[model samples]
Target: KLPPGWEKAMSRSSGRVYYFNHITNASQWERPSGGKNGQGEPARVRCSHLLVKHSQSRRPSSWRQEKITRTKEEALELINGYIQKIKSGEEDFESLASQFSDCSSAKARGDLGAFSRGQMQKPFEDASFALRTGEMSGPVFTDSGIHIILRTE
Candidate 1:
């Protein structure tokens, strides 16, 4: 199940959402590696928050504005560069995102799956809406740092 403040974001944008179980305080106890007594689970570590993006469009999708690193200029530079790479056929987005993304969805090739609008942060929504299908944009800075977006059809 999603943590608080997640379901609404999911429903609003019709985008895909990604989260790490370690991030949510309530779910911290649920990490699979650990048993009831923490015998099997991996050692506890501070988990970061979820990293979400809209999958429906490449334009900037609305996402919540929160604190993070990577300046706007830096983010733009990275995203534009990534888009150029895609256009040049020098990289595969899914592979790149999976290898590079800081979120758990990176394991799934950055596939957030389908979701609704207003389910994410304002900045995420803004960023997503700015993209066009088959196009990529950003190193858009979010609370999670720079994001390279690809809008799927």
Candidate 2:
């Protein structure tokens, strides 16, 4: 269940769908295109969705979704461990994120960049908006995965 006072945003008629995934589908690439890269067997891609509204656009008709294998408690624990490390100054943001996060943004230091408040999952936006500059928050869990957030003004 979502936390108190949090509401899931609905897809707007003119919004865009954002797909976040742990891995890409290797099979989609052609054999000569260097697709597999020796990653062994190909697997189905796992993905989740985020909805955003363009200034003058309509929402997409459908969205993608993914299943999370971990329970919320398990996800929270992992997030908490990362947050502790960051708070203790024992791990830099990018390093900790790269080592622990499941999302592709882990490659970019978990930088989701500037996005509108309603453009993200409720739990993620809650954690991100909860912090002040230089402050940190969460092992928050969303549909995509867990997150340890750092706010830079």
Candidate 3:
């Protein structure tokens, strides 16, 4: 089954509906003239992240979802300490992430694979880009709470 955003375009001449995917809306669809299927691009990454969102999180949305209650200091120290464990080789990054990281990427061991630059919040963006490959950073706070970012090439 298709996900929520998949759309259907009705053909005026034949009265047929064509199913396709779009970004935001059909206006931004990047297809060739006369409506061929959009060219699918392979995924590329500048960096990846391991976000650990607690209460007081991004866009005033998820954190305020009325369940998370981790205070600022509580989340910060906890997340950074985890980063330290991975850094010292005392713990495995993916294992710790699967067990404790709050973000949706945790299922894949915190793989926030390659997103568009403008699509990311400033604090989150800068923290990831500032690191070298295979580095780990944490306690990076913003509206998104304490983001524990793992720099993946």
- Against the unseen true structure, what C-alpha lDDT does each candidate score? 0.43, 0.44, 0.58
**Global CA lDDT computed for model 1:** 0.43
Q: Which 10 consecutive positions of candidate 1 have the poorest summed lDDT?
A: 22-31
Ranking by TM-score: 3, 2, 1
User: Native-vs-model 2 lDDT?
Assistant: 0.44
Which candidate has the highest TM-score of all?
3
Ranked candidates, highest lDDT first: 3, 2, 1
Candidate 2: give the clashing pairs: 13-58, 13-59, 14-57, 14-58, 14-59, 15-58, 15-59
Candidate 2: worst-modelled 10 consecutive residues by lDDT: 21-30
Q: What tens digits encode model 1's per-residue C-alpha lDDT throughout 128-147?
A: 54333443443444554455
Segments of candidate 1 deviating more than 4 angstroms: 1-81
Candidate 3 error regions (>4 Å): 1-46, 59-66
lDDT of 3 by residue, 1-153 (tens): 332234567656766555543321211123312333444332333554455566566543342244666677777678767767876799888888777766666678778777655677777766555544665554566576666666677
- Which residue ranges in model 2 land beyond 4 Å of their true spot? 1-70
Query: How does model 3 fare in lDDT?
Result: 0.58
